[PDB]
Symmetry: D3
């Protein structure tokens, strides 16, 4: 909990995030994947370059969010979805618009919760999409009532075994769990300074790919897909590294992705 | 002669050389005892109006997946050593060497397949790099952490997952890479469907669930880097083979099980942590 | 579930004479096999018209014999105790159990047909208020924690995951309670499942486990075996006799042969809920 | 080891209730018996040679269980090797050899018992097949999977179950057979009753629960083939011994604990998978 | 429910040993453990006095209340709103001290209906019966709700149950971040196996002593991370040697003293956090 | 291994360390415990006296560690996982007169250790060598006692304890002084993460230490929190000029209890 408060007294308090959500209305708090489109990007000497760069970055960010939903498997309007650490509800809205089902979000930031519902009412879907302040480790959802859940870059803030144990609980048998995250590669040995820098920067705790796989195995979660998206997210960062929205953590990511001490992966497992 | 089962599973491959695996291995010289992946080039194939071209197409797909497997062995130099658990006739071994120019140690229960492999190995003039030998993949002679990469290309249904991965984990160097292409019944389905059981009775093997594969690896310091379902890629191969005359009579079991999702063809590449 | 949905359809139909014509002479319809020597006396000679009629009786006797043998390992059980039958079939064992202990006997099966058949026959005996079968997955039963005095799996554990099934029994089973199971498992001493075993799996569309899995699964679920006996020699007679009858289903060989070379074995395990 | 040290003390030190029985067959056993008592040929207290007949009866029952144990070692030829963890004076070892004519390696902590065993072994002219040696059953010199069958006849209460079974599992050949006759407190009872604790304090040992035995075996690739409770078979032995004059003063603890079911005498025969 | 406990309950439903009651009278606090800390021989003047034995009982009781106090020192911060649990509370000696020191709720649990009533009886006298309460119940299956207990402990009562099951329970009703403490005697795994001395103690109290190894592993398997692990053998030795010369002797003094000497048995204290 | 190269580099490549080693002759790469000799310290050559005080505290904890190695004769062998420059190794030998095998990833530290070892004329008893503490050459159960003095944050707990448990004799003694984030706090606080990024290491939770030992036949005999004892050391070092810039992270984390300095001595069961 003492750490939980650290996270709450954090997210309840950037440009590189809001200005992008300002274009679509979809506010994301994760990273992008995909080939940069230097077509619509234009050159650095145009009256509205930075404006086009923000659009490109946001596109990539919405791109991975969409990519995540592709692994939630078949899901009808009667099913319920859970978003552990939903942020401002960006992914939640997309999910609903795409499946027209119930989407329950959960976050530690009362600010993010309200922001999500606020934006939810505007779209007139507040009765299907709802964010609430709650710890993803102890959620109110009943056993096996959720068709699919996921963690889009929010698993570095909690204990893997405990979090997957929860998902496994409220997740229906045969249900689908997905997660996009950054984990230090066990093949490298131990967390490199780069990774530690990212932890100190976001005040989180990155896990190894080994922990992710073992944690899932110990919680009746059998991976159906395990793909390394590092090559897909590299473009996003290198582009963001040249912008002015830079937060100062770009190097840590780019470098760690380069030497392979850190990796961006996606895992979709079944609730067996 | 480890166990009574491995006596039958050994006598099997020692006394069984079907046309569907030889006639194909003939076109190249590389003999394969597994299945293929990828789309079918019907253009260059033509219609049944041919059989010689069909064998080439089937063989292409089979060599295609073998190549696909090697793509997941990661970087490997001429100084590294590779192990092939249940190498069969050495098809994959030859390709591996030609592609990396390193040592390739194969291991099989069939003395026939072993000799066949080395025989063909001498012809290519690589017998001093590529070598097959009669031995149980569960108790191999390779020393601890001396192997750069190993794999199981459709041969893990003949042994206990924990024991086999435990062995690989042993002789495999820290940071090494392990890969495996296999067919496992989907735990999402519940239990092995009749189709799967039919395949077991046909090949006298024991197919595992995707759950066992993942847990077994986790219990043996094997962290999966890639886990892809190749069912959609292998379907074409079977449907085509189903129309040929090389048919062995197990085509239906595969096609059907792949269809209803009770059985799946997957590829897993994990690191030796 | 997709798999279980398959076993439901399988049994909803069935109607094998080798199974009904035997439970007719008693009302105790069993869907398992039998142990014990053969009473060739009451058997007689094949050159008789009522021979087949006597063969069915003999086979049924052996089948009811093992069912009785199973109950012998449930330990002391009074009229106030509750018993569970994972995969009860038509209720053959359930009726015997009640008649023998006069207690509650809750059965559970995937076949709605078998369920109704069981209750139907249950009302005839006038015990429907003590013996009841219901359509439900033995892996997720409605019985409350530690309220069951004893439960068992009479040839039905090949249709589910051992850890999950024993975990359930361990749940609703009272501390100190007794669990029993009669099943066929491939002997790990042999190495791997022989073709014979695989043939049996494909035939019944099931999934036989190794004796190793049974023991480990129980150990991981607070189930300590009190008795572990190999009944292969006791069930052999049953099969060899059935192999000569006309009720033959075509899987007789697989069993006989696998039992012979020791790749497959018929065992009974009775463990305590620690 | 400090424990083993003083467990060796005990053993380097001759109960009449032990030697006097073994002096009738040359079969020096150090355990208890099973089987119903033959009152007829036993005798009536109203006679002189009664006690002499009682010793014979008790010894018979003790050799009876030893024989019963060997019945669970499965097939074993003259070429096979057997191990006796905590062999005592070699009683069971001699019987084993005479019955299978194979190598029988014994191991004990008591140098006295070792020499006694070999001494008696030379007399029978089998010292080149049957041999006892001072060594800890937890760290034996036998090579991996070279033993056809091993066992613990009332000697597992002196060591850690996981470690001891781990050892047996090591030197035991795959498919080999392990057997053990012992007394363990029934987990069904809850915890060790005073009776059991009294037995521990008496023999300076550490009785385990039936739960530990089963779990320990499962964790060491030992799958039980047979698990039978011999309490009813050993009761007669004790009740008879309770009336004799060889009484050591621990008879009650056993009889009572067997009665209330807090303690049980069981036999377990498992395969080395 | 269960043969064994069925006994333990019967066992304690008799008790009445003077080496317990005469020592609990001097103060009003009725303990059922042993003491720690050096002995004040000076306070035990002219052995040839009608008051020596009276002073010896006071000294022994002091040492016994001393360790009880020492245990509470490891319960960490605890306010009047928190709830504490005493697995195998005995007559409530430690419970009363705990409350007087923290003024919070103290739930005790024992198998002896006699000890339970005695505890509440004495609890009403102090006028704290609405905060301190003992009840007949198995510490392995307690009625307390999940994570509602701020701190719990086992003061020499863990030898009567299965470590994994008991710690699993504590871990259940114990709040996340909560504190668990336990003072007990366990045979040192460094010695090998339970020496006769230990077995004698088991047969004497009809219990089942565990190894320090089981304690540590059992806790690790139940989300209980030890913050402190101290061997109090040297601190409890004085208590026994003194008690060995008294007339309250129960006949188990030697087993303890000797086992503590050769190191086959040890008196330890463990304070872990509920992670 | 790739990570090992990083750490190797780190060490092959400070004054606050060697300066203090100049006085006694012992070179420690850890920290100190115990109260400060506030009086006899100062308020001209103040800095010279401050270095002596800091070094005293550092040698103090090193000594404190050896106190938990239990009885050890001249015939016994000791292992120092991540020995650094051999400071603790020398003290150990001078105190027990036995064999002291050290192991480090830095060839520089290894040679420095042996160099200094020859000067004291004990090179035939005390020896440092370049090797990974996870895969040491020592034979099974031949070591009487081993330890990790602030070096366990550079390796996997299960693997490292598994090794110690291997070469360590049954009944042997293992000790370790380290900093671990308190699981009671929840997760690693920024302070801890800052320390990781600073030393390029990976701090573990007290939970991992205890579980890892339990899984490797290592039963803790003593578990004491030395945070209050090491606080003085840091606050004093925070005012000196040897400051490396990581002082705050430590002091603060120790304060809010998100990070703790503990000592664990377990037996090889
Ligand atoms: N323990 C926790 N319980 C619930 N939510 C948390 C917890 N820790 C962090 N979070 C939230 O997880 C989210 C992580 C963010 N990167 C947002 C992820 C979100 N999927 C998005 O795409 O925006 C933030 O809202 C954090 O506040
Ligand atoms: N237990 C075993 N140990 C070693 N080899 C085995 C074992 N079981 C089966 N095999 C061999 O593994 C191979 C399985 C075949 N499907 C061939 C696979 C081979 N990788 C190929 O693609 O040609 C055959 O050579 C089997 O004889
Ligand atoms: N998952 C399941 N849940 C409930 N019942 C099942 C399940 N799987 C199989 N069964 C039933 O288990 C029974 C197995 C049969 N051999 C009957 C066993 C029964 N004890 C008897 O001897 O009559 C059948 O009724 C199956 O339908
Ligand atoms: N750690 C040990 N290693 C080897 N033997 C032991 C050990 N501890 C006890 N023993 C022996 O275990 C034996 C137990 C006796 N009851 C003899 C058993 C023997 N199987 C018999 O049938 O007589 C004694 O000879 C002990 O010396
Ligand atoms: N299974 C059990 N469940 C609950 N309490 C038990 C159980 N077994 C023993 N006890 C209690 O353990 C207690 C141990 C006694 N030494 C009292 C300890 C108590 N902390 C005291 O200081 O008095 C006894 O009061 C027993 O009643
Ligand atoms: N894999 C490794 N094998 C051996 N040593 C290592 C390894 N990783 C890190 N280290 C050592 O970790 C040590 C950390 C130092 N603080 C040790 C100081 C030492 N305990 C002393 O007080 O002198 C460095 O000296 C490294 O040499
Ligand atoms: C997909 C699965 C589960 C494969 C198991 C391994 C196996 C029996 C290979 C045989 O291939 P083959 O090429 O030697 O024989 P076939 O003639 O059938 O191609
Ligand atoms: C140990 C093994 C292999 C058990 C098989 C369990 C099973 C499916 C029994 C059905 O018997 P049944 O009596 O209903 O059908 P049949 O009489 O035709 O065999
Ligand atoms: C748990 C069990 C059965 C322990 C028995 C230990 C034992 C055999 C002790 C002495 O040998 P002995 O039994 O030959 O001597 P005695 O018959 O005089 O007790
Ligand atoms: C240290 C160990 C193993 C204790 C277990 C036995 C126990 C609960 C003693 C305390 O009770 P008590 O104080 O009433 O007993 P006694 O009358 O001997 O003081
Ligand atoms: C969690 C903790 C405390 C880990 C220890 C990290 C470490 C190597 C400290 C000593 O460094 P050093 O002595 O080489 O340099 P410094 O002068 O900073 O102590
Ligand atoms: C993948 C990892 C380790 C994430 C940890 C940080 C986090 C939860 C979000 C970062 O994106 P953001 O949009 O919320 O913040 P920013 O884009 O400003 O970095
Ligand atoms: Mg962003
Ligand atoms: Mg082929
Ligand atoms: Mg039938
Ligand atoms: Mg005797
Ligand atoms: Mg007392
Ligand atoms: Mg320093």
């Amino acid at each position: 909990t003492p750490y939980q408060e650290d996270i709450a007294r954090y997210w309840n308090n950037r440009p590189v995030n809001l200005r992008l959500g300002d274009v679509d209305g979809l506010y994301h708090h994760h990273y992008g994947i995909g080939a940069v489109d230097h077509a619509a990007l234009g050159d650095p000497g145009d009256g509205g370059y930075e404006a086009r760069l923000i659009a490109e970055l946001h596109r990539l960010e919405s791109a991975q969010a969409e990519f995540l939903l592709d692994h939630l498997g078949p899901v009808g309007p009667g099913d319920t979805l859970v978003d552990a650490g939903c942020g401002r509800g960006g992914s939640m809205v997309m999910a609903h618009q795409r499946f027209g089902c119930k989407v329950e979000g959960v976050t530690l930031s009362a600010a993010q919760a309200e922001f999500g519902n606020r934006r939810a009412r505007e779209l007139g879907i507040d009765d299907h999409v709802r964010s609430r302040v709650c710890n993803m480790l102890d959620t109110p959802f009943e056993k096996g009532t959720v068709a699919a859940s996921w963690n889009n870059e929010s698993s570095m803030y909690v204990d893997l075994h405990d979090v997957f144990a929860e998902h496994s609980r409220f997740l229906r048998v045969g249900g689908r769990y997905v997660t996009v995250t950054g984990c230090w590669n066990p093949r490298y040995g131990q967390p490199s300074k780069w990774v530690s820098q990212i932890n100190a920067h976001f005040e989180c705790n990155i896990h190894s790919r080994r922990e992710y796989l073992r944690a899932m195995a110990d919680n009746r979660l059998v991976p159906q897909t395990v793909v390394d998206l590092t090559p897909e997210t590299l473009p996003y960062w290198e582009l963001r590294a040249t912008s002015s929205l830079v937060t100062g953590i770009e190097e840590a990511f780019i470098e760690s992705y380069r030497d392979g001490s850190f990796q961006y992966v996606l895992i979709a497992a079944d609730r067996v």
